[PDB]
Design a protein around this ligand. Structure first.
Ligand code: MG
Ligand code: MG
Ligand code: MG
Ligand code: MG
Ligand code: MG
Ligand code: MG
Ligand code: MG
Ligand code: MG
Ligand code: MG
Ligand code: MG
Ligand code: MG
Ligand code: MG
Ligand code: MG
Ligand code: MG
Ligand code: MG
Ligand code: MG
Ligand code: MG
Ligand code: MG
Ligand code: MG
Ligand code: MG
Ligand code: MG
Ligand code: MG
Ligand code: MG
Ligand code: MG
Ligand code: MG
Ligand code: MG
Ligand code: MG
Lengths: 205, 79, 129, 156, 123
RNA sequence: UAAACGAUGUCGACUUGGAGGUUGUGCCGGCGUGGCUUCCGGAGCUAACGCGUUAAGUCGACCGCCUGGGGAGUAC
RNA sequence: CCCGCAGAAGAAGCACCGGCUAACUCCGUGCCAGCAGCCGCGGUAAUACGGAGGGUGCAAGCGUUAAUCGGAAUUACUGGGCGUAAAGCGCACGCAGGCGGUUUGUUAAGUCAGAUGUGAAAUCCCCGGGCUCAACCUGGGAACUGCAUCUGAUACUGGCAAG
RNA sequence: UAGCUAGUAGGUGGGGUAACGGCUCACCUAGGCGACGAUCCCUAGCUGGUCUGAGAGGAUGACCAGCCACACUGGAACUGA
């Protein structure tokens, strides 16, 4: 129900940084990021169009740490919701509580944010929520519980987030360890490297 | 109003009874072509007024025999 | 034998356009005149006229834009072997609204947009695009 | 500047006195992503030469397609030989819902949202021709208004 | 066909008979082995394929393939069969389930156990 | 019952041409105007071959018929 | 449900990797043993059999079988064909049936418009609300494309009358 | 599977039922059903819905709710609203 294996294999297969490490070091100094894993990694056998769609889907899944059944349900919800299906899917993924905890800088990675959520360190609107997939809505306040404010993990994670592009759809107070989900991100707020139409097409087959 | 049906007499060989073919024009549920469909009713004809070929107006009543639950109203146009 | 004069008129238009005829002529009828009136006011034909007392003949002036016939497609929909009626909610759009459907309503023969605006359905005569 | 896609490589053969002579065919499409698309078909003894010939031909056979903000103007049908295709406008975020050779053509032409179906033969050379034919016989509101002597508002 | 013709005689669907009739729309059936045999395939293949003739609980007598290397089936053995034909063996349209009832699993098998009757090696 | 064949159901309308055959008819060997018919060919159509105003083109009305090869136009 | 306690401790498997189809190599075998959904693979230099290393896909499940719809526009109403691929009855007359040139009047059956009654609740869908989330539960709507009746319209189709 | 039907179809009168009714009986007429598929044969509980499908369709009727039928097999009435 969670991927527990080596992390940089996933990035190396996707051929890009999935941000599955804290980012204290460059991912180059920890692995051969330009080479796919395994004995025949250096090879680069032509990828079919199906392969391209599959790899895009897997890359987004692995960024956010979502298994296939949950991800498929996300696609179904995005298709049901009014508007652009791929943008809806990205918005749903960004709304996850573990992802929001990471985006506010409380967790060094999304897996650390997930553990913070799971281990009951996170409050949404003053109430403990330990569900990683909980959907945060606009104007919600996400805070570190008082018992967890002394954790060195969280201070280090806030330091790390200081050295990333700050999301504009959130408002974090690193002193009180509180953040506000102002609005759902638009597509411009998310990376232009994600090609979500490929995921939509994959699931529409 | 009174609910009525209009049709062609196709048999009058029963005492005080006739058989009336009612015609309906219905759209075919699959092909959409409007087709003609027939309903045959045993109708009570007191006075034995109707002949084969007349066009009669009928109305529904209580059962009068095993197969009769309609009675003559009038002959709209005779044969 | 001749059993659909409207399909005949549509076919005469289609074939005359394919042959680059400047005009086509057919025996007239009031229904054909109503359809031709819709065609003219929608810009698909230049003009029409009826001549003759006892055997009226309807002449349609065809139009061409840039070496191409203006009537790109013209298609019978309701026909004697299968009549097609639509309520106002289900009036067809032709070429996503860039064409027309010619509809016989109880207020007369008009385009599908005009029938929609008048809140009527009717018989779908033809599609013109 | 132009997107280039290779659709199919096929090995063909002719017979001679000594035996069989094998050669290769390449079917490619090129497009500018903004309504210009062309297809090329090349043959050569070797695959890279066939592909290069196909690319050269494709760059010289591009036609113009009047797209409406990444989708089609209206439903269209295209035909060539045994291949019959149907294409439809779709809302934003509908991807290219299309099969095979159609996908390549529509991608390089700049169609981002479309619902399509291929009928008859799905042979790639003929499917490409039918898809381009369908995109060619598609009208914009401006062209319809122009040919009918109307303004665009009274058209729509 | 015209619409009138279809009103008189509508479009007729095909029946699509089952290729595994002896199962009678059951996922598996139990049977007793009537003989354990070995047979030669159609061209262009050649080997000695292991098959059993089995009388199923519903009275059908059918031949079923014994997949994998090295069965223990020896007549009066009661087995479980599932659907699935062997292409190069005429008349063989069932597989016996390895590891069910009297059919043992394949002995030294890794890699797709559970299609044969093999427990996880573990220790 | 036949490869009973144009291997092409019947009826109607419409849509560039050329060269003949046959059989009427009007006017002055010429110019028209009908019926049937042979060959070529244009658009269009067709998988192609080809068809092409006698359509396999563009349409309408109605009917007959097809649904992988074999088993079989067989068995009952 | 909440709060304390101890410690990463008590918690990972299954199918696949010739093409379709994401994922490749070595040793073992030698048309054998075996694989196989289709195409096929195996006769010494096997990414196709078997084991391993590596990899891919799913994951507290994963595969297989059965079974339905889809893909199949492959029964084609939407939406197919019939010169040669399967397909025009050997030809015709003709009842039932289907279809019907043109004008006016009338009718208002088809058709169309509005309304009324009904179309159980649940379900589906939309908007909200409750279980930490979700599944689940749930408030209002939409929808139930139908049927009947009443009142209108009269272009088209039908009836009737005259041409 | 092309013919089926003599309480059979209709009428009159008596009886009968909570009630109309060949429901039943007597008499009279000779009808009634059927290629818009009667009769016969095989299969089957029906619906709301469910699965699939872009839709039109196709498949289906477990759970939940409505209707029906049955209660070892065949038959019968009694009591009772
Ligand atoms: Mg789970
Ligand atoms: Mg009764
Ligand atoms: Mg095909
Ligand atoms: Mg014969
Ligand atoms: Mg002869
Ligand atoms: Mg001959
Ligand atoms: Mg013949
Ligand atoms: Mg010719
Ligand atoms: Mg015989
Ligand atoms: Mg691959
Ligand atoms: Mg070897
Ligand atoms: Mg189908
Ligand atoms: Mg076909
Ligand atoms: Mg032949
Ligand atoms: Mg043939
Ligand atoms: Mg013939
Ligand atoms: Mg005849
Ligand atoms: Mg008429
Ligand atoms: Mg009416
Ligand atoms: Mg309801
Ligand atoms: Mg809530
Ligand atoms: Mg509700
Ligand atoms: Mg009239
Ligand atoms: Mg039963
Ligand atoms: Mg479909
Ligand atoms: Mg049913
Ligand atoms: Mg009593």
């Amino acid at each position: 129900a969670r991927y527990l294996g080596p992390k940089l294999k996933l990035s190396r297969r996707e051929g890009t940084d999935l941000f599955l490490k804290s980012g204290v070091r460059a991912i180059d100094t920890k692995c051969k990021i330009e080479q796919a894993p395994g004995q025949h990694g250096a090879r680069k056998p032509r990828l079919s169009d199906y392969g391209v769609q599959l790899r895009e889907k897997q890359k987004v899944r692995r960024i956010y740490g979502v298994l296939e059944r949950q991800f498929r349900n996300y696609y179904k919800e995005a298709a049901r919701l009014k508007g652009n299906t791929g943008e809806n899917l990205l918005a749903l993924l960004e709304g996850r509580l573990d992802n929001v905890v990471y985006r506010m800088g409380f967790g060094a990675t999304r897996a650390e944010a997930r553990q913070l959520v799971s281990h009951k360190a996170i409050m949404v609107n003053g109430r403990v929520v330990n569900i990683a997939s909980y959907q945060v809505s606009p104007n919600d306040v996400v805070s570190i519980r008082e018992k967890a404010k002394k954790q060195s993990r969280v201070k280090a994670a806030l330091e790390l987030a200081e050295q990333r592009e700050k999301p504009t759809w959130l408002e974090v107070d690193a002193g009180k360890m509180e953040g506000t989900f102002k609005r759902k991100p638009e597509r411009s707020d998310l990376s232009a490297d994600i090609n979500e139409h490929l995921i939509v097409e994959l699931y529409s087959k | 109003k009174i609910r009525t049906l209009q049709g062609r007499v196709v048999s009058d060989k029963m005492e005080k009874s006739i058989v009336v073919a009612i015609e309906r024009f219905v759209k075919h549920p699959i092909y959409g072509k409007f087709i003609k469909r027939t309903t045959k009713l045993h109708v009570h004809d007191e006075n034995n007024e109707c002949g084969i070929g007349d066009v009669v107006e009928i109305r529904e009543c209580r059962p009068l025999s095993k197969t009769k639950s309609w009675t003559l109203v009038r002959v709209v146009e005779k044969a | 034998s001749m059993q659909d004069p409207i399909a005949d008129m549509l076919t005469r238009i289609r074939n005359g356009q394919a042959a680059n005829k400047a005009a086509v002529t057919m025996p007239s009828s009031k229904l054909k005149v109503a359809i031709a009136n819709v065609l003219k006011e929608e810009g698909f034909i230049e003009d029409f006229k009826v001549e003759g007392d006892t055997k009226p003949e309807l002449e349609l002036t065809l139009k061409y834009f840039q070496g191409k016939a203006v009537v790109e497609s013209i298609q019978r929909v309701s026909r004697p072997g299968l009549r097609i009626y639509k309520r106002k909610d289900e009036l067809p759009k032709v070429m996503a609204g860039l064409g027309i459907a010619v509809v016989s309503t109880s207020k007369g023969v008009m385009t599908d947009r005009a029938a929609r605006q008048a809140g009527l359905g009717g018989e779908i005569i033809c599609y013109v695009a | 500047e132009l997107q280039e896609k290779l659709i199919a490589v096929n090995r063909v053969s002719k017979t001679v006195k000594g035996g069989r002579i094998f050669s290769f065919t390449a079917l490619t499409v090129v497009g500018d992503g903004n309504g210009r698309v062309g297809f090329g078909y090349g043959k050569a003894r070797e695959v890279p030469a066939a592909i290069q010939k196909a690319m050269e031909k494709a760059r010289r056979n591009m036609i113009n397609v009047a797209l409406n903000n990444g989708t089609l103007q209206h439903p269209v049908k295209g035909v060539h030989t045994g291949s019959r295709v149907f294409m439809q406008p779709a809302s934003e975020g509908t991807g290219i819902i299309a099969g095979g050779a159609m996908r390549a053509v529509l991608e390089v032409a700049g169609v981002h949202n479309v619902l399509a179906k291929a009928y008859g033969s799905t042979n790639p050379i003929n499917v490409v021709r039918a898809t381009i034919d369908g995109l060619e016989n598609m009208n914009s509101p401006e062209m319809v208004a122009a040919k009918r002597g109307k303004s665009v508002e009274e058209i729509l | 066909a015209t619409v009138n013709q279809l009103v008189r005689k509508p479009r007729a669907r095909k029946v699509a008979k089952s290729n595994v009739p002896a199962l009678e729309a059951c996922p598996q059936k139990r049977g007793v082995c009537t003989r354990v045999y070995t047979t030669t395939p159609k061209k262009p293949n050649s080997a000695l394929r292991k098959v059993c003739r089995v009388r199923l609980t519903n009275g059908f007598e059918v031949t079923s393939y014994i997949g994998g290397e090295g069965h223990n089936l020896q007549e009066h053995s009661v087995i479980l069969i599932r659907g699935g034909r062997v292409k190069d063996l005429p008349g063989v349209r069932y597989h016996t389930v390895r590891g069910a009832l009297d059919c043992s699993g394949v002995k030294d098998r890794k890699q797709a156990r559970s299609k044969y009757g093999v427990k996880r090696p573990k220790a």
